[PDB]
Amino acid sequence: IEGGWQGMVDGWYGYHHSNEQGSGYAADKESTQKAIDGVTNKVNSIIDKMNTQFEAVGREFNNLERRIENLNKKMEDGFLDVWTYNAELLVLMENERTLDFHDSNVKNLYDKVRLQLRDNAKELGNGCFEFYHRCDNECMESVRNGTY
Amino acid sequence: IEGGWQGMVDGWYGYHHSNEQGSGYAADKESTQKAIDGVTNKVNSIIDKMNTQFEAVGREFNNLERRIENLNKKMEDGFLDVWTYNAELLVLMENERTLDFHDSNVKNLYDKVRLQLRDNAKELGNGCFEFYHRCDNECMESVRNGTY
Amino acid sequence: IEGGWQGMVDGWYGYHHSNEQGSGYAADKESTQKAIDGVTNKVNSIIDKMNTQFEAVGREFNNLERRIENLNKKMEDGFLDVWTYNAELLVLMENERTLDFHDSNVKNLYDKVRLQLRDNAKELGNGCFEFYHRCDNECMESVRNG
Amino acid sequence: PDQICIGYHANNSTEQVDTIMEKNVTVTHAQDILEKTHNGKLCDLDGVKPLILRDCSVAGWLLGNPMCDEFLNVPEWSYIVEKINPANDLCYPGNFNDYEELKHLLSRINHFEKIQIIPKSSWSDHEASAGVSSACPYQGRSSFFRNVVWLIKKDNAYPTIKRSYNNTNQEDLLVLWGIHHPNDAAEQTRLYQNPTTYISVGTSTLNQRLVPKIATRSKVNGQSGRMEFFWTILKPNDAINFESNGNFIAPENAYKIVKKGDSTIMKSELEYGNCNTKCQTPIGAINSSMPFHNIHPLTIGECPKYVKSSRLVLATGLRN
Amino acid sequence: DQICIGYHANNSTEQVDTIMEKNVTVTHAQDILEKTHNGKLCDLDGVKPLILRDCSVAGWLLGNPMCDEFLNVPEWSYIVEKINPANDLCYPGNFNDYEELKHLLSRINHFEKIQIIPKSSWSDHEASAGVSSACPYQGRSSFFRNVVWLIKKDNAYPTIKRSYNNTNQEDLLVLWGIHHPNDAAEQTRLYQNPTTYISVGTSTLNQRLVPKIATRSKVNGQSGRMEFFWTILKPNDAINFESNGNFIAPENAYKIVKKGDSTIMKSELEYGNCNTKCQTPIGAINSSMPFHNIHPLTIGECPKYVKSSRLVLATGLRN
Amino acid sequence: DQICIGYHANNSTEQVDTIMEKNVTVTHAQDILEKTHNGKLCDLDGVKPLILRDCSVAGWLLGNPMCDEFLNVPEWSYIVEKINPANDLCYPGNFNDYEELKHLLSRINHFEKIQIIPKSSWSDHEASAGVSSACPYQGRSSFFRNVVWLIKKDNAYPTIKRSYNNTNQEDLLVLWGIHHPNDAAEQTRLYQNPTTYISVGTSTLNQRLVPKIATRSKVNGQSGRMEFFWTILKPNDAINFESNGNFIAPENAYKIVKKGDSTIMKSELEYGNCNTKCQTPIGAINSSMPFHNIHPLTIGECPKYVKSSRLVLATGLRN
Ligand SMILES: CC(=O)N[C@@H]1[C@@H](O)[C@H](O[C@@H]2O[C@H](CO[C@]3(C(=O)O)C[C@H](O)[C@@H](NC(C)=O)[C@H]([C@H](O)[C@H](O)CO)O3)[C@H](O)[C@H](O)[C@H]2O)[C@@H](CO)O[C@H]1O
Ligand SMILES: CC(=O)N[C@@H]1[C@@H](O)[C@H](O[C@@H]2O[C@H](CO[C@]3(C(=O)O)C[C@H](O)[C@@H](NC(C)=O)[C@H]([C@H](O)[C@H](O)CO)O3)[C@H](O)[C@H](O)[C@H]2O)[C@@H](CO)O[C@H]1O
Ligand SMILES: CC(=O)N[C@H]1[C@H]([C@H](O)[C@H](O)CO)O[C@@](OC[C@H]2O[C@@H](O)[C@H](O)[C@@H](O)[C@H]2O)(C(=O)O)C[C@@H]1O
Ligand SMILES: *[C@@H]1O[C@H](CO)[C@@H](O)[C@H](O)[C@H]1NC(C)=O
Ligand SMILES: *[C@@H]1O[C@H](CO)[C@@H](O)[C@H](O)[C@H]1NC(C)=O
Numbered sequence A, B: 001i002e003g004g005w006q007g008m009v010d011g012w013y014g015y016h017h018s019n020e021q022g023s024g025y026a027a028d029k030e031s032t033q034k035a036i037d038g039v040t041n042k043v044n045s046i047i048d049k050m051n052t053q054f055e056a057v058g059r060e061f062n063n064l065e066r067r068i069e070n071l072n073k074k075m076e077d078g079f080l081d082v083w084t085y086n087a088e089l090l091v092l093m094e095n096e097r098t099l100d101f102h103d104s105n106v107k108n109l110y111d112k113v114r115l116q117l118r119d120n121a122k123e124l125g126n127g128c129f130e131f132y133h134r135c136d137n138e139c140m141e142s143v144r145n146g147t148y
Numbered sequence C: 001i002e003g004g005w006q007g008m009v010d011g012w013y014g015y016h017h018s019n020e021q022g023s024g025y026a027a028d029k030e031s032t033q034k035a036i037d038g039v040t041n042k043v044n045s046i047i048d049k050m051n052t053q054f055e056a057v058g059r060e061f062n063n064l065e066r067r068i069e070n071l072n073k074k075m076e077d078g079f080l081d082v083w084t085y086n087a088e089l090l091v092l093m094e095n096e097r098t099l100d101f102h103d104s105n106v107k108n109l110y111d112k113v114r115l116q117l118r119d120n121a122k123e124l125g126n127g128c129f130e131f132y133h134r135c136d137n138e139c140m141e142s143v144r145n146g
Numbered sequence D: 001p002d003q004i005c006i007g008y009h010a011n012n013s014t015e016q017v018d019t020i021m022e023k024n025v026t027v028t029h030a031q032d033i034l035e036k037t038h039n040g041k042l043c044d045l046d047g048v049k050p051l052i053l054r055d056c057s058v059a060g061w062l063l064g065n066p067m068c069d070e071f072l073n074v075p076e077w078s079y080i081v082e083k084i085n086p087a088n089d090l091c092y093p094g095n096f097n098d099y100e101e102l103k104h105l106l107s108r109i110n111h112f113e114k115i116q117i118i119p120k121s122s123w124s125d126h127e128a129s130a131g132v133s134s135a136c137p138y139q140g141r142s143s144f145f146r147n148v149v150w151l152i153k154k155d156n157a158y159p160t161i162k163r164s165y166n167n168t169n170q171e172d173l174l175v176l177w178g179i180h181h182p183n184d185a186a187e188q189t190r191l192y193q194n195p196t197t198y199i200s201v202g203t204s205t206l207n208q209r210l211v212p213k214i215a216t217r218s219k220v221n222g223q224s225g226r227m228e229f230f231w232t233i234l235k236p237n238d239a240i241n242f243e244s245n246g247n248f249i250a251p252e253n254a255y256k257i258v259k260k261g262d263s264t265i266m267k268s269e270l271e272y273g274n275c276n277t278k279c280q281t282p283i284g285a286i287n288s289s290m291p292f293h294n295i296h297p298l299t300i301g302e303c304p305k306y307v308k309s310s311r312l313v314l315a316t317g318l319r320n
Numbered sequence E, F: 001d002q003i004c005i006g007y008h009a010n011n012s013t014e015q016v017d018t019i020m021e022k023n024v025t026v027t028h029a030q031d032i033l034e035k036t037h038n039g040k041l042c043d044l045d046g047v048k049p050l051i052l053r054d055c056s057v058a059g060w061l062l063g064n065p066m067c068d069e070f071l072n073v074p075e076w077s078y079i080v081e082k083i084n085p086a087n088d089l090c091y092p093g094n095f096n097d098y099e100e101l102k103h104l105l106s107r108i109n110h111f112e113k114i115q116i117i118p119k120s121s122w123s124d125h126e127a128s129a130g131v132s133s134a135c136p137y138q139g140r141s142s143f144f145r146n147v148v149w150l151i152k153k154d155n156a157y158p159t160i161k162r163s164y165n166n167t168n169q170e171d172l173l174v175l176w177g178i179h180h181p182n183d184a185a186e187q188t189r190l191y192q193n194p195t196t197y198i199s200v201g202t203s204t205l206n207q208r209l210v211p212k213i214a215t216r217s218k219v220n221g222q223s224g225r226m227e228f229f230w231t232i233l234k235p236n237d238a239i240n241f242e243s244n245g246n247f248i249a250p251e252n253a254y255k256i257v258k259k260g261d262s263t264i265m266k267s268e269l270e271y272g273n274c275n276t277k278c279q280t281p282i283g284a285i286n287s288s289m290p291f292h293n294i295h296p297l298t299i300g301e302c303p304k305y306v307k308s309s310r311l312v313l314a315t316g317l318r319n
């Protein structure tokens, strides 16, 4: 695929059909539903795992408690560095998975149309499929519906 | 693929042949051996990585040492929360990678049959192939074997 | 694919053409330039991410301060275990990505030639294509060129 | 020739996120998860006002530094705010024993009821109305801590004091007292007559005997003398028993611990802000539904989790 | 005519979680989290713990009369103490650096109690009337067994000057105290002398205690106070006590016979007549799992503790 | 005719690890862990450490005669102490709050020692008899250089009153001590007065010490003891001493001239005649790696310490 389509503001994934009748976009709701759930599950799971995070507390020491004052300082900075690391590292890794996750769902959706019409259509290579028969608007919905 | 076969109780991945002779299941030991080694290397690697984990130790303080007792308590809970986070997170990460690992081995094995018989067989769509010639049980073993 | 080619010392990924004129190897600079950057970005990201690591400090305690001495010891060793774990696990996880990333780029480079030469070429199976027409060196450049 | 294609959402969102191997990557949607802004002031915590100590320290508050009269009988508080280096502390120089441990208890307390456990009129054989120092000014004159009494000799005599107080209250009681370390032998007999003195204090757990330390010290707030102050928690039905033949700074008022709960002692230079909040930091209050913030490590109330990250944004949509 | 690729399935219903999916059924999976304990205190690898029952460590080491069960205990694997032991210091007071001594004690597996100063060695002091209603025993007033409360004899309390040289191969835990009376009258009544001291010295220790007269609340019926101290006397070192009053003298001391891994467990359980590789204060664990969520404080060959309610790894595939 | 896709290979042999695969041969490996060190103690960015050799910090500061190498040391980058230095307190005793002083010392890079109370300024006391066989030097009895052990003169020890005012801009580390004698006879033989005290006051300090006269074990042939104390005298503050005996008076104090990052390292190593940006107790490190596993106590510009034996990032493909 070259790039995305601005002409589809209906959903995240979909189809563009060209027809003797007309031509226009259509979002795949079953595939979009699965992605909104998988993303909303992820973002919430990141928040819930991090709510056990370290909470610092002010502690006061006198001028002959310098060693424990330093120890206290090291310990609290230590934990905040760890958890800062965990927060950042998880976000970077989650973003990688999330971008590759959207990719996977484009490959899998392309294969489904390739599989749903195997011998009745030729794959072009740019993310399309040419019918070897005439497919009207009910037929085209059937390809979008899943029953074919 | 529609779903998994209950009929197969030999291995994780395999073939179901249909033939003029007969019909039955057959596990691919070559791919299965690779998966057992992989999974076992993961679970052991997880246990042995969490070997270097924090150990809590009972310390006691009198009632004019409330500051260090609280520091002690926060640092031990702190490490426990960190390691709890690490254990749970690594499991969720390894589980996702493990389920995608079994998916990869089915794609990798399906392409092996498609490439092995390129011009001599048609691809259907539901994870199957149609021979353009007669393939008896010894021929079917040759597809399972590797040499073809 | 069976395995790699020792013949190709030019880059990481590339092509080996066979032709009526001659035969030799040719590295894809478009995909190799992308892989060198991705690897350099990952190694430097690991170095910077671990730049905020715990630093043990020497502390002295007397004979009647064994409890806090033990607290200090376990706290430091506690952090050193955590950052050791962090460093090793991140290498193992990055290595897994790095190797599969190289596999990913081979599959994508393979499909690019299959896509570029669809109707006028047959796919073999061992990472090769067969032209139904005559493709000279300038034609072979075109397939490398894109 | 009829056709159907697979594609995806694109738009003009320039918003960027990072990943392991790719910085500044543009995406159609991106969810910020970090809160970087605060209201810049000190607020009520869910409808309860904090105790802002202004220029007074905890010690100055509790002992009753004359400059600290605003805080004689304060209402219930959510948190306590103190400056990093407060002006009104131990007006008469010296030290507060186990001060940080007292402060630690104070972060679990939300309200005191101050009560009079020893009346100033009750000292009949001692002078109780001249325990003043220019170190503790009040409205242009020498004064002293309001909650303790600096007793001296009367008619060239200091009879041995034996006082007791039984905590007949249902609550715990913070009790304070001190000792005066004079400058020299002459000062000692001038103020207390007896050259060798002590202060015994006992409860069920406390067994204390203080002796004054004479030494030659530098002037702090004009005084070479020093006061060293002590405290204890007196449990219901226990009694504190004081005995002394000199140098005794006796209790006058003490504090019933009437409310325990979540509190803290914040260090801040900010003054009260007439706001309400669910989340206070020493540098500002926070009103956010974000999971993370990077304002300050020390907070109280319903708050997000602190990180040191400058930036934290989750990818939500596809590449763009 | 046809051949196909496929995968395994069974009536499994076992579920696991992932980053973006939860409640996902699989064909195989490995639980790695132990959640069960036997609910009792056991021997640790064949070695029985020291169960102080209703005694504190102080009650045990000083020799509280209610703690006679523990006058000479055998080697232990760990020590078990209740949260609030009823038999602590029968005569009220305090144990100096008590928490530090408890720390040392977590590195000790066995003492051998020895006599070092016989009660009968005190010629010029009364060694047999040092008792109190605070320390009952078999219907009468008694006292800590391991130390001696010396009082005056024939209206005199000569200055004590006594050495003990640790001629043993082992480190020696010596215990002593000072009595804090209620008033001057009490002071002269027990010790004759109004102004008293206790000097203690070793090669490292250089101590001077003075009794502290105050009016105190009655604890266990006593307004008086005993304050205890301790030290580790090294082999070939000597301890010198000097005192003219208020001295609670050593009688028995403890030779440190075995050091090794131990701990003091806070637990309300009693002995459970069992053996285990791994103990918590809540119950013992017998598991081949890598993790557990029973209790953070353990001893023995245990798995690693976490706060997780559940931890299960996927191995097989979806269902 | 034909075309084929492929990838680089070679005879690399080098291995990396992954989550589910150990020893995986790759064409380009990237080790990111330093395992080597020079095994010596070196200058830190051109500043030499203070190597105390056989001397402790206390012996250095008090001026133990065996530590005369360190009387007036130049600026250092870090301090190096042996695990058990032979030359500590030559006359036995203790250093009060010794661990806290060592902490402050780890925040300091330079002192300038000055005389604040000359030995010749003591007109009614003996200053040049404060010597001991416990502190030998060139085969004759001596003592700490920076402090002075005063004794009676002409069977008299008048009450001492000495103030010193810190007129300098630097904070001043001041050191004094007190002598704890063996018995009454020695007390009067040394100081004449049987009942003594040392008062010390600043704006913050308020101390009254009374000697402990008791029987102790010999350390370096002395049953006596010296107990040392220190304070930081702020610019323009004064320190006032009063005593009628047992006073070990200041002679020299230390001006804190510079503060920064420093440390007190424990090591057996001698000076390495070398320079480094990163130093551990067991050897220096010159590396460009992000990590190292030499030692966790580092000073300078170092890699990040891990306990790992191996860290190998994969960069190229498989083999
Ligand atoms: C009687 C008289 O002349 N009073 C005032 C002067 O004292 C005062 O000059 C100050 O003197 C200070 C020491 O004096 C006090 C004090 O702390 O203010 C005076 C107090 O009455 C006395 N209080 C008691 C209970 O005895 C107090 C006490 O003896 C010592 O604190 C014990 O250590 O001493 C000090 O030297 C100041 O530096 C000095 O300014 C002058 C000027 O204010 O006015 C007189 O009214
Ligand atoms: C009647 C009489 O003269 N003595 C005993 C009563 O006092 C006692 O009632 C208890 O008395 C307690 C204090 O008495 C003792 C004690 O601790 O039990 C008696 C000890 O002999 C004495 N020990 C020594 C070595 O002198 C001890 C000691 O003087 C003080 O503890 C020092 O602080 O005091 C106390 O007042 C209790 O409130 C009370 O129950 C009765 C028991 O019924 O026995 C009488 O012999
Ligand atoms: C300042 C002074 O006069 N020091 C004495 C010193 C003190 O009297 C004593 O140390 C104070 O506690 O005693 C010295 O003699 C004791 C010493 O004699 C040696 O011969 C022997 O080796 C030692 O075991 C011990 O008996 C001392 O050297 O410290 C003499 C000194 O002049
Ligand atoms: C205080 O008063 C109560 C009620 O009379 C009494 O029971 C208790 O003994 C007293 N406490 C003390 C320490 O005297
Ligand atoms: C203790 O006794 C041994 C053996 O008699 C002796 O060598 C040693 O010096 C003595 N220790 C002390 C401190 O007196």
Ligand SMILES: *[C@@H]1O[C@H](CO)[C@@H](O)[C@H](O)[C@H]1NC(C)=O
Pocket: D218, D219, F165, F166, F167, F236, F237, F238
């Ligand atoms: C010390 O000397 C300075 C200068 O003479 C003087 O101003 C100051 O008050 C003195 N400080 C003290 C505490 O005596």
